[PDB]
Amino acid sequence: MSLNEKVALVTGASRGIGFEVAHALASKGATVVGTATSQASAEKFENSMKEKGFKARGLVLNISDIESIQNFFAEIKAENLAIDILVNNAGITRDNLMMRMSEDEWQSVINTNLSSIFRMSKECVRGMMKKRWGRIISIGSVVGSAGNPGQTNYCAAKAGVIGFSKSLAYEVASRNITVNVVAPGFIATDEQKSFIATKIPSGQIGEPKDIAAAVAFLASEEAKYITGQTLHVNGGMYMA
Amino acid sequence: MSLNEKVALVTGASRGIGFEVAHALASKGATVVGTATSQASAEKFENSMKEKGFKARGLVLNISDIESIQNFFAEIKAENLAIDILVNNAGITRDNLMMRMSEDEWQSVINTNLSSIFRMSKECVRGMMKKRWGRIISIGSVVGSAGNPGQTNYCAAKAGVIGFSKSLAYEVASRNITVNVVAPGFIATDMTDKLTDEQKSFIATKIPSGQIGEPKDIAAAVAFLASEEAKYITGQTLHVNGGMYMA
Amino acid sequence: MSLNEKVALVTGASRGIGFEVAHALASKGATVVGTATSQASAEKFENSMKEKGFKARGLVLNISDIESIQNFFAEIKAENLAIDILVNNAGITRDNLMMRMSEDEWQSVINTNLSSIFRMSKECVRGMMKKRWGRIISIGSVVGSAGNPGQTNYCAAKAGVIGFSKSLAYEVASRNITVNVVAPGFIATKLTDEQKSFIATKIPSGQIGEPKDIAAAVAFLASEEAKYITGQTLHVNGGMYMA
Amino acid sequence: MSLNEKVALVTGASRGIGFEVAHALASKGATVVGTATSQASAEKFENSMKEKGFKARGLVLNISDIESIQNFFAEIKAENLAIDILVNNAGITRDNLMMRMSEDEWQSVINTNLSSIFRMSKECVRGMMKKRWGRIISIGSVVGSAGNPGQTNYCAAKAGVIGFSKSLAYEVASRNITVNVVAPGFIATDMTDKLTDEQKSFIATKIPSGQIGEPKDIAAAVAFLASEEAKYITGQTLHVNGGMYMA
Numbered sequence: 001m002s003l004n005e006k007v008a009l010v011t012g013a014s015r016g017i018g019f020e021v022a023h024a025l026a027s028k029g030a031t032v033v034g035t036a037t038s039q040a041s042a043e044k045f046e047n048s049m050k051e052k053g054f055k056a057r058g059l060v061l062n063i064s065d066i067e068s069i070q071n072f073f074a075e076i077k078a079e080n081l082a083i084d085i086l087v088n089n090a091g092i093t094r095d096n097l098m099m100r101m102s103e104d105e106w107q108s109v110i111n112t113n114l115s116s117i118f119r120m121s122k123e124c125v126r127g128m129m130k131k132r133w134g135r136i137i138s139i140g141s142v143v144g145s146a147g148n149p150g151q152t153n154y155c156a157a158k159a160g161v162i163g164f165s166k167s168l169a170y171e172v173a174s175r176n177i178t179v180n181v182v183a184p185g186f187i188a189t190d191e192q193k194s195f196i197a198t199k200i201p202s203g204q205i206g207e208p209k210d211i212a213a214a215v216a217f218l219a220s221e222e223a224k225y226i227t228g229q230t231l232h233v234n235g236g237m238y239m240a
Numbered sequence: 241m242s243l244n245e246k247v248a249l250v251t252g253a254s255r256g257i258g259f260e261v262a263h264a265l266a267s268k269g270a271t272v273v274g275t276a277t278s279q280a281s282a283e284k285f286e287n288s289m290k291e292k293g294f295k296a297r298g299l300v301l302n303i304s305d306i307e308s309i310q311n312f313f314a315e316i317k318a319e320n321l322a323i324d325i326l327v328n329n330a331g332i333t334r335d336n337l338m339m340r341m342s343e344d345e346w347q348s349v350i351n352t353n354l355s356s357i358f359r360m361s362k363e364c365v366r367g368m369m370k371k372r373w374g375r376i377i378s379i380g381s382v383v384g385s386a387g388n389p390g391q392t393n394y395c396a397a398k399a400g401v402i403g404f405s406k407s408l409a410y411e412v413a414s415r416n417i418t419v420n421v422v423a424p425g426f427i428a429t430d431m432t433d434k435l436t437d438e439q440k441s442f443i444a445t446k447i448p449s450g451q452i453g454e455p456k457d458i459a460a461a462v463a464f465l466a467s468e469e470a471k472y473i474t475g476q477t478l479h480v481n482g483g484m485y486m487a
Numbered sequence: 488m489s490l491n492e493k494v495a496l497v498t499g500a501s502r503g504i505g506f507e508v509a510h511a512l513a514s515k516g517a518t519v520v521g522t523a524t525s526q527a528s529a530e531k532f533e534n535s536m537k538e539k540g541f542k543a544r545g546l547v548l549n550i551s552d553i554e555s556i557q558n559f560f561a562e563i564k565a566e567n568l569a570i571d572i573l574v575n576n577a578g579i580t581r582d583n584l585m586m587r588m589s590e591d592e593w594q595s596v597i598n599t600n601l602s603s604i605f606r607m608s609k610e611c612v613r614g615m616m617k618k619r620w621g622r623i624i625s626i627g628s629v630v631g632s633a634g635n636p637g638q639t640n641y642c643a644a645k646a647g648v649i650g651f652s653k654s655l656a657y658e659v660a661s662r663n664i665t666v667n668v669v670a671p672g673f674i675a676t677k678l679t680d681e682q683k684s685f686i687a688t689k690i691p692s693g694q695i696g697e698p699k700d701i702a703a704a705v706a707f708l709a710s711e712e713a714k715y716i717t718g719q720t721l722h723v724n725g726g727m728y729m730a
Numbered sequence: 731m732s733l734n735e736k737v738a739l740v741t742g743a744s745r746g747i748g749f750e751v752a753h754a755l756a757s758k759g760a761t762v763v764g765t766a767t768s769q770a771s772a773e774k775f776e777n778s779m780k781e782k783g784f785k786a787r788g789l790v791l792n793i794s795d796i797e798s799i800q801n802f803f804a805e806i807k808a809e810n811l812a813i814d815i816l817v818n819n820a821g822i823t824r825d826n827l828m829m830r831m832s833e834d835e836w837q838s839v840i841n842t843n844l845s846s847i848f849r850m851s852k853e854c855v856r857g858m859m860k861k862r863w864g865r866i867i868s869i870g871s872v873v874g875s876a877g878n879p880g881q882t883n884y885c886a887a888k889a890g891v892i893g894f895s896k897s898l899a900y901e902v903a904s905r906n907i908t909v910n911v912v913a914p915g916f917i918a919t920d921m922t923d924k925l926t927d928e929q930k931s932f933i934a935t936k937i938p939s940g941q942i943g944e945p946k947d948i949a950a951a952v953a954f955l956a957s958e959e960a961k962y963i964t965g966q967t968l969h970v971n972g973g974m975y976m977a
Binding site: 612 | 796827828829831833836837840844845847848851852855856859873874876877878879880881882883884885886887888889890891892893894895896897898899900901965
């Protein structure tokens with residue numbers, strides 16, 4: 001129970017990676033706050049977690065909308081929930097060839113996938129600093145490092161997340177706060193699947209639990225000397 | 241004289257790295273469009289270069305205003321200047337501890353250092369593709385790879401520039417367009433001049449060579465990547481920093 | 488606790504990082520074979536591990552000596568030990584400015600810190616492949632990636648360990664064998680003033696790490712839940728180098 | 731002609747990358763010493779260069795053999811040749827699955843591609859430090875950073891080249907010596923000519939443009955790094971691979 005008395009926030013925790021990350025953290029004793037864009041999903045998350053024997057709280061949050069972010073934190077404040085572990089999982093793609101890409105597609109992805117890390121980390125870091133302990137872990141993507149056509153905006157955001165994290169890691173280190181990125185390759189969440197996995201050494205697409213286990217490792221007290229790092233979980237498709 | 245038939249666009253070409261870049265490409269025979277915030281500065285650049293016997297145009301361009309970008313590409317269109325080499329020199333810093341950083345300080349940096357590359361690249365790519373030749377080169381920064389406290393905004397933007405360039409390099413490679421980043425370390429410049437004696441000294445402790453770079457160091461790397469002989473280099477980041485950061 | 492019935496080999500397990508790694512794997516129920524260069528150290532290791540209620544075997548191995556390696560694998564074979572987890576921990580430094588550096592200082596370091604990786608993995612990979620499960624994890628070093636003056640030989644070796652691992656990862660990935668590198672920064676295990684200064688200036692917290700920091704990371708990679716991580720270098724260095 | 735009065739050494743300069751590198755350096759003004767494993771290839775080199783109007787010398791070197799290295803440096807010293815620029819281009823593959831790989835296959839590759847770097851740099855670095863100027867440039871491979879199946883020895887070696895080079899960069903940086911690696915991707919050479927039509931085609935799927943590079947591509951990057959205007963670049967790996975690997 002490494003994480004007894006820690007409170008963890010996992011954005012977009014409804015399904016896939018987010019949920020598994022929420023499951024993995026609760027499994028180590030953490031209290032988990034998960035977010036979804038709708039109330040119904042926030043309830044589905046909450047009941048499903050509490051159903052598996054966990055103390056969880058489902059809350060509404062759209063990380064792309066500063067008003068939502070602002071309301072969100074007023075609520076955890078009202079519910080006396082201090083965040084010790086932040087997992088930036090939520091995000092979106094707006095794929096297009098750069099030449100046809102509109103301002104909305106570019107700006108939406110930068111705003112949702114990059115600025116959101118700044119905005120969420122900004123609202124959690126003072127708490128962790130006072131308590132002299134914290135974890136910030138962001139879900140990146142292999143494409144932030146390898147690049148990918150049709151995704152100039154997504155790759156830019158994802159690379160920026162790493163840059164942000166390396167920089168913040170310097171700022172918060174003296175307070176026992178680590179800041180890291182977990183970069184997934186192809187993860188289950190159409191075959192196509194066969195061809196995709198031929199570009200992957202292991203010959204298979206990963207699963208949400210692959211990402212959750214890495215996030216949970218980085219969030220544990222035993223990864224305290226790991227900061228500013230990018231941990232690629234991708235079956236060898238990209239090796240740094 | 242690899243670049244005799246080429247037209248280069250250098251943003252913020254008035255002085256420093258921007259100006260040496262202009263000089264460097266013109267030297268190779270390029271016709272160079274340099275951009276500046278003001279008409280006088282733009283005029284100053286043009287007269288400067290033409291004085292040294294180069295083919296040069298200085299135009300007004302503010303890279304944070306979508307409107308200004310729009311007017312600019314219309315003017316070169318009418319002047320029959322199609323861009324073959326784009327050098328993104330633009331960028332600013334608004335340093336602050338992350339916890340204190342304002343929405344303005346964050347968004348300003350992202351917009352001016354990162355979103356600008358997309359905006360400018362988008363206006364030049366079609367012409368290059370049409371001709372099946374192009375160079376896109378963006379001036380990044382050592383902190384984009386190393387990180388640096390007090391610059392979560394600038395580090396995110398500069399790292400983002402690399403991600404953008406990697407991605408774009410794939411889209412345009414078939415049309416013989418390369419996309420690369422030159423990442424300066426500590427270079428003598430107007431910005432660096434601001435720094436105090438102490439913070440100059442501190443940075444000195446991080447440079448194995450014991451030298452502070454000069455704009456020509458950046459210009460040279462840029463001009464090399466712009467040349468035909470760099471055709472087989474794309475999606476790369478070339479660090480020019482005296483050993484401060486080794487990739 | 489998934490490591491029950493898994494057999495692990497940690498070279499140079501007598502003390503420091505190797506010993507903590509052996510303790511971490513054992514703690515997950517692995518049977519741990521630890522090696523040392525002397526019989527006294529092998530037994531001391533074994534006795535210590537068994538002392539703590541773990542199953543362990545201490546054997547003699549000089550990873551720099553081919554004959555020693557040949558005898559070693561002859562012995563594990565006669566003891567019916569199939570190696571599921573290989574942790575290449577053992578190594579050495581012969582520091583010098585490049586220009587003064589002897590052929591012998593160069594060769595010894597490449598031989599002990601790089602070639603040993605090839606030689607130990609070559610003796611373990613067939614077993615893993617037949618069972619279709621394996622972990623190879625080598626202890627690298629921050630200097631393999633960052634470089635460090637006075638250590639051209641060591642940096643070359645530790646960078647090569649990464650090259651080897653990436654290549655090997657491709658060859659064995661389909662048989663559910665992962666190959667990774669854990670690269671420690673400064674870890675307390677006799678510090679030079681330079682090292683103390685580097686600690687003070689290059690690590691954001693200014694704190695040196697501990698053997699448990701490296702053991703936890705090795706154990707995480709060795710676990711079934713890291714099945715989808717291969718060809719990677721996990722830096723455990725307090726942020727002194729950020730890849 | 732920043733290389734007038736400089737002397738460069740290219741190991742394995744008979745053909746392919748080695749020869750174009752020699753050619754590229756001489757074009758910047760360097761006096762070039764090239765090496766071959768045979769007295770006939772050594773002459774052929776010297777003849778070919780001097781034919782093209784260059785000041786060149788070809789000498790025999792079996793770089794796997796320390797005694798040969800010893801005799802070579804004896805020879806250049808007897809001849810008044812002080813090396814300012816060292817390009818380590820010699821190297822071989824012995825591809826096999828790691829599990830089948832012999833000691834010969836392993837050590838031959840480590841010795842030729844990695845140990846040779848130390849041995850040759852050790853013989854040039856003093857004179858460079860004395861003169862307070864030098865370049866060391868090693869030819870790596872993309873697989874050194876990307877990894878490749880069937881080449882555990884070669885990938886190990888070429889990754890070691892980068893580690894060695896970073897380390898050496900710190901030691902010599904203050905004496906104005908830079909140390910860098912140029913890492914070719916898929917370039918037309920003799921061993922490439924030994925690939926089946928199908929192997930070639932398959933590799934093309936890994937390069938964005940789908941183009942195979944040429945020796946001039948590597949020679950151009952090497953000559954850049956060797957030039958004086960590359961003075962602030964050290965400890966770097968410049969990937970020349972058409973986008974096959976982006977770092």
